[PDB]
Design a binder for this molecule. Structure first.
Ligand code: EMC
Ligand code: EMC
Lengths: 361, 361
């Protein structure tokens, strides 16, 4: 069997034709950005599962299986909470210029791009409250995506929508992971991890998601299998210190708004309803990596994409879809772990957030 | 009984504290605009029922009854299809400046405005394809709303989001209607009518919604109870002529995207779930005014608001809510009829759309 191994770069672009672009702003009061997932020409079948709603979603109704539009070209993940939805307008503008969207005239230039977006809360984490992504930053992200070749490695860590992301007080960020199925199809995820809950078991210091990893995939990051009690005691103290200092700097504790945004993708052909099921099932992967999740205040959103390049079968259909559904959860769990490990700490007038590796590696 | 009569101006602002603002652009290639419904200080309980999705919705997930945010301050209705969602960013900016939104810091200036929006398709109807509402036009609409006193009459016709609206080939627009309940509560609707279907019975020329009118409310518009067969024959011919000319001018037939946007409001206190039921039930009012509705390509969206100023009871609760639910459908039916009657025809390089009264009055 050829399955159970990561794709070439262990990331979202291992789904052929998918491109990812980041644009960010750091320094001078800023710590935010935008990540765009760009489908190949012709678009991708897309669905969404939102748990905890807005503030900060756009065009989610368009992704209902009953609706007219059958594919989309781009999903926008952004900082800036509801304000950052402004980034999506810049992406829609770019798509129009490219002639990419729902056709609304005999002239191929006349199109309406359906651009779903979800935003995470990172306000003030650079120091300046009104420092949020705008249309220009959104445009920059999709232009960055378009400039990449197929199968290009995805940058992880404090980039794009992950720039200002924080998970349980630790620095969060962008992470990605993939897996090849025995059928040869690839399933992959990209996550911007900004959760209220913890990626770390408070009893041990072990990352919750680590036991879902594929053999050896995290070895390059350099964290021991066994974490010493003294190391974990020290890490907990440092995190508590950072949290108290952050609360002082923000003139108030920890954000009431938090979340994880994600895109799961595959080249296996899915109907919209099957993609909607995949988006829903991928939330399980988040639960296995972070605890607690899906709180009242947590705006967790997963988009699912199919490029429709491989038939599900190269109850047999159910079995094939179950493989994709199970992989969808696992790649999201793994992407969250990668985000946490890829992050480097920050220290700004808007927050002090050390990374996992700064505490445990 | 004091019920079964319209409120003071027969419109949405008969719900005390509600304000409505329009901003539009006409001429020089333009025929579009934005309508904002602004809740009183402290916000309103809000819900939504979307049928036919996007392209062109924003922050609808935030209105789910499970979610954190308990009230909102503004709903944005806009032209420009998905591009026009850009208008909502301007409204969010204004709300932030006013300190109005979900509180996210001990400082009252730190807020995240939840601004739901829905867009209708009017592209190119002024002549210029890229002539769509932007953030500035959205800001202008909410500023216009804020400048009005309570209980101010709502302008109808080709204004705000109704500027470029077309219903079954006839000029559409903004319409509004209200009714007082025996309890003393008011229920009202505002509609931007842009449907694929017809407001007019093709067999007779009679407006479908007219028989839902309250006694005498349409008398000021001057259309006979009995429409002559010859008048109706002439009207049908003129509409067909306008449709064929429009198709020539647009280098292609009639838009694939159409809809009706609406806001229903009441001062009776509703939970979010009760408001969601009201939004769903109000769609029935649309069905009674327009046929067909809710087609695959029709993006019909109804927002429902409660200002929470009157108790439902001043199974009794069910009976009181049923009165509100029934009124919600009726005021929407009536608002659609008002939109059709208030409209005046247009003739631009992007379309020829006569009004109902130009054909039948
Ligand atoms: C801040 C909820 Hg994605
Ligand atoms: C054009 C669908 Hg509100």
């Amino acid at each position: 069997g050829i399955g159970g191994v990561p794709g070439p770069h262990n990331g979202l672009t291992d789904v052929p034709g998918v491109r990812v672009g980041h644009a960010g702003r750091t320094g001078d009061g800023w710590l935010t950005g935008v990540t765009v997932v760009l489908a190949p020409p012709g678009g991708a079948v897309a669905a969404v599962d939102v748990r905890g709603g807005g503030p900060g979603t756009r065009e989610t109704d368009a992704l209902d299986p009953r609706n007219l539009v059958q594919t989309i070209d781009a999903v926008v993940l952004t900082g800036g909470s509801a304000f950052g939805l402004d980034a999506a307008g810049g992406v829609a503008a770019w798509l129009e210029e490219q002639g990419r969207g729902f056709p609304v005239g005999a002239d191929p230039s006349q199109v309406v791009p359906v651009v779903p977006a979800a935003a995470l809360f990172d306000l003030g984490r650079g120091g300046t409250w009104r420092a949020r992504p705008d249309a220009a930053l959104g445009r920059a992200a999709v232009e960055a995506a378009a400039a990449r070749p197929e199968g290009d490695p995805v940058e992880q860590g404090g980039v794009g929508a992950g720039t200002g992301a924080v998970v349980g007080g630790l620095k969060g960020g962008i992470g990605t992971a993939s897996v090849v199925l025995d059928s040869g199809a690839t399933v992959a995820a990209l996550a911007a991890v900004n959760a209220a809950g913890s990626a770390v078991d408070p009893a041990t210091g072990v990352l919750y998601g680590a036991r879902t990893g594929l053999p050896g995939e995290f070895a390059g990051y350099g964290v021991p299998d066994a974490i010493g009690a003294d190391t974990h005691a020290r890490a907990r103290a440092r995190l508590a210190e950072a949290a108290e200092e952050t609360a002082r700097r923000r003139a108030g504790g920890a954000a009431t708004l938090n979340c994880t945004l994600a895109v799961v993708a595959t080249d296996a052909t899915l109907t919209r309803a099957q993609a909607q099921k995949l988006a829903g099932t991928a939330h399980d992967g988040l639960a296995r990596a972070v605890r607690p999740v899906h709180l009242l205040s947590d705006g967790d959103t997963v988009f699912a994409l199919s490029t429709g390049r491989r038939p599900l079968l190269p109850h047999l259909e159910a079995g094939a879809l179950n493989e994709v559904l199970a992989a969808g959860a696992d790649v999201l769990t793994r992407a969250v772990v990668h985000a946490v490990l890829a992050a480097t700490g920050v220290d700004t007038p808007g927050g002090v957030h050390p990374s996992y590796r700064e505490l445990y590696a």
